[PDB]
């Protein structure tokens, strides 16, 4: 018999399946003998200690900055003062160097949120003594010479002595549940084009600069014994808090600045000396 | 990966850890490294396919600094923003990868000519672009897609695009993601360990194509290297919200 | 962990490590990196014949070259760097019994441990960082700063407290085995003897007091916690 088949359905044609997505379905065709065979990870597989998410990477302590503290720094003096924006280290100049893991990874997103952690490591010895006060300041800032304005915020006073390190969790206090990155979502400039206002007026966005700052001021002047160094370096580490969040994949704000050479064809492109 | 928590010995009081904002706006979480690597990256934007060559070669390797454009260097057929895509940024942190990659190839045409995509397993070289294998001057009688290697065909009049998944056909446990200098002439067997083979696209008549790449489902990265030295000049190209 | 009051020999509360016929004591605390896994499952396939271990020779502590740290060292400076196992065979502690098996086997899988002992005085200060980079051939000059070191398996040394540090190094390589020796008859297509790099870098410059010493020293010690050899051959001198 050759009965007619009356089954039918209306269809909407599309060229690809799951093109924009990072998960879901794919209509990829395997260049294999068996269309469903896959790579084996039975013996060779990702080591369990490798990071699995960008948040894991953001949880790695990175050295952000350093500053000096000497026996000559009078009380109230700002030893450290910075806008704490994981989106950009500077709003008025280029950055080049070893960015921290959390800033590197934050540079891939348009939004971030949650507390940020700092760790101050005083490169000193048991004969250095003094006290500093760390403060997280929001919305409105303090004068460099008005220590009291810093003391009115979220503070942690550290008594430097036998212990040479102090941890500080920077509270997340803003008028929005998340904050938008100050870097750009797309920057087509590749040849360091001398910029003008028309270029800026036609940028991908408008930089919402942060006013949130973290400062470290002298409480009790550093008083090391004469036999040791009178000035010490303080290392400032930074990483995302346990509830740090990231969202909105975009063009990476940071890019390799050292030893960058694009591939050529090997051995066709003159590898045969 | 070593978090460094081991070096944080302070145990004095701290402010609250708060509550995460993940999932507050939506459930579209985008922090999974594999999820990020599975979204497509443009490699070649409207490049030419010429039938006088064996085909256009695409080395099987994920996006990374190996394809980064540097102002002033010679012009290649690679799109210039590959080095700043989130996935290239991620790959620049992992020197090992294992598994398959998926290539989305689009032929700018509506003709009924078949365009073939042939897979070449790991053979030791690393090339890209149009090439005349063994420097001959005619390839229609000795087509690479007709030699025995796995091949798939695109027929633009039906669908000018296709998505092919290439296997991890190599002798090594892991493929090496990148080198400090992609043009250094060092030990030849090691030189070819940054790819797992090639994909070759061959047309009937001259035509253009575009190519995107992404990680397959059976894919893993490892050998975390930590972050490299970076740069940024974003600040200079936009106004702040205070004029 | 806790000091005691002074007696005839001072504060006698040292700890120590004994591995084979070698012992190393420590006066203060010690920092240790995480014990992490190596690739397993390829050994029985890459080698049709059984692989070997010689623990009494390889698992003992062997001191390598002395490292000098001076007040002129800047952050990020390389104080020392090792391509392993290569540098432990033909450049540092060359007559060590730990090197014996490498003279006759052509392949191997290696898991090590490196202990670092520093001796700065109480009026000095500074920070040094030691890290490992797996399968580093042709990728030593990138992801090579203190930042990358702080992200990879590492140990930190404070130059005035003299805490010891132990770096645990698993075998993570893109091939099943690493080749042990180069040879006039061996191929030049594959650079052998290197599956990882160890970097010793300045994190914060050494500083001293008035009329104090302008330098101090650090000494690295290595030992294999698991060295498996494959492919027996005639013995050859190392590199």
């Amino acid at each position: 018999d050759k009965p007619k088949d009356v089954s039918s359905i209306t269809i909407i044609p599309k060229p690809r399946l799951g093109f924009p997505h990072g998960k879901g379905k794919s209509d990829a065709v395997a260049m294999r003998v068996n269309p469903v065979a896959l790579t084996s990870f039975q013996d060779v597989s990702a080591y369990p200690d490798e990071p699995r998410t960008t948040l894991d990477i953001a949880r790695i302590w990175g050295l952000r900055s350093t500053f000096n503290w000497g026996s000559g720094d009078e009380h109230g003096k700002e030893l450290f003062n910075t806008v704490l924006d994981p989106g950009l280290r500077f709003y008025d100049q280029d950055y080049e160097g070893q960015i921290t893991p959390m800033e590197y990874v934050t540079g891939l997103y348009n939004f971030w949120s949650g507390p940020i952690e700092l760790r101050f490591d005083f490169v000193s010895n048991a004969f250095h003594t003094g006290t500093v006060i760390i403060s997280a300041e929001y919305n409105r800032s303090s004068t460099n010479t008005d220590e009291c304005q810093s003391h009115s915020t979220y503070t942690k006073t550290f008594h430097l002595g036998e212990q040479k390190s102090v941890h500080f969790t920077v509270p997340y206090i803003y008028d929005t549940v998340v904050r938008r990155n100050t870097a750009s979502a797309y920057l087509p400039v590749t040849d360091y084009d001398k910029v003008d206002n028309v270029s800026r007026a036609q940028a991908m966005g408008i930089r919402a600069e942060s006013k949130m700052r973290v400062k470290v001021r002298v409480v009790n002047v550093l008083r090391p014994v004469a036999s040791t160094t009178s000035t010490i370096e303080v290392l400032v580490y930074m990483r995302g808090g346990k509830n740090y969040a990231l969202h909105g994949l975009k063009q990476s704000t940071y890019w390799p600045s050292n030893s960058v050479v694009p591939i050529d064809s090997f051995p066709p492109d003159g590898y045969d000396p | 990966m070593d978090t460094g928590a081991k070096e944080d010995e302070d145990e004095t009081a701290n402010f609250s850890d708060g509550v995460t904002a993940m999932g507050f706006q939506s459930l579209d979480t985008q922090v999974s490294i594999k999820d990020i690597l599975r979204r497509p990256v443009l490699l070649f934007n409207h490049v030419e396919l010429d039938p006088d060559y064996t085909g256009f070669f695409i080395p099987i390797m994920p996006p990374s600094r190996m394809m980064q454009y540097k102002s002033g260097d010679k012009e290649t057929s690679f799109q210039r923003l590959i080095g700043r895509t989130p996935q290239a940024a991620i790959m620049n942190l992992f020197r090992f990868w294992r598994g398959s990659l998926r290539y989305t190839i689009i032929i700018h045409s509506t003709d009924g000519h078949p365009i073939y995509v042939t897979h070449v397993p790991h053979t030791g070289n690393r090339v890209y672009g149009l090439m005349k294998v063994n420097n001959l001057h005619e390839y229609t009688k000795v087509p690479i897609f007709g030699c025995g290697l796995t091949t798939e065909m695109i027929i633009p009049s039906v669908n000018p695009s296709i998505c092919v998944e290439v296997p991890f056909d190599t002798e090594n446990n892991w493929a090496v993601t990148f080198d400090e200098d992609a043009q250094r002439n060092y030990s030849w067997r090691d030189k070819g360990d940054t790819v797992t083979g090639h994909l070759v696209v061959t047309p009937v008549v001259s035509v253009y194509m575009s190519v995107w790449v992404e990680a397959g489902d059976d894919f893993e990265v490892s050998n975390f290297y930590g972050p490299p030295s970076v740069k940024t000049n974003d600040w200079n190209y936009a106004f702040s919200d205070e004029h | 962990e806790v000091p005691s009051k002074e007696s005839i020999q001072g504060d006698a509360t040292q700890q120590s490590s004994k591995e084979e016929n070698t012992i190393i004591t420590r006066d203060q605390q010690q920092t240790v990196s995480e014990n992490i896994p190596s690739t397993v499952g390829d050994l029985v396939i890459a080698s049709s014949e059984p692989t070997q271990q010689f623990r009494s020779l390889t698992n003992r502590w062997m001191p390598i070259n002395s490292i000098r740290v001076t007040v002129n060292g800047k952050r990020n400076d390389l104080l020392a760097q090792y391509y392993i196992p290569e540098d432990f065979l033909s450049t540092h502690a060359k007559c060590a019994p730990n090197t014996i098996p490498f003279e006759t086997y052509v392949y191997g899988k290696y898991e090590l441990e490196m202990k670092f002992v520093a001796n700065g005085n109480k009026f000095q200060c500074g920070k040094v960082i030691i890290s490992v980079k797996f399968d580093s051939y042709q990728a030593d000059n990138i992801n090579t700063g203190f930042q990358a070191a702080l992200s990879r398996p590492h140990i930190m040394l404070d130059l005035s407290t003299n805490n010891e540090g132990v770096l645990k190094i698993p075998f993570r390589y893109h091939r099943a085995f690493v080749r042990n020796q180069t040879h006039k008859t061996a191929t030049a297509g594959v650079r052998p003897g290197k599956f990882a790099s160890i970097y010793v870098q300045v994190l914060s410059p050494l500083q001293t007091g008035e009329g104090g010493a302008n330098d101090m020293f650090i000494r690295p010690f290595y030992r294999y916690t698991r060295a498996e050899f494959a492919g027996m051959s005639y013995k050859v001198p190392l590199t």
Partner: peptide, 26 residues
């Protein structure tokens, strides 16, 4: 020719990579 091809002799080993003895590379 291409300056990337070979590393200068004073900074490299026989394998055309930085020598582990060459500390100034950073």
């Amino acid at each position: 020719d291409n300056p990337h091809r070979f590393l200068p002799a004073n900074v490299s080993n026989r394998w055309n990579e930085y020598s582990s003895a060459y500390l100034p590379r950073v």
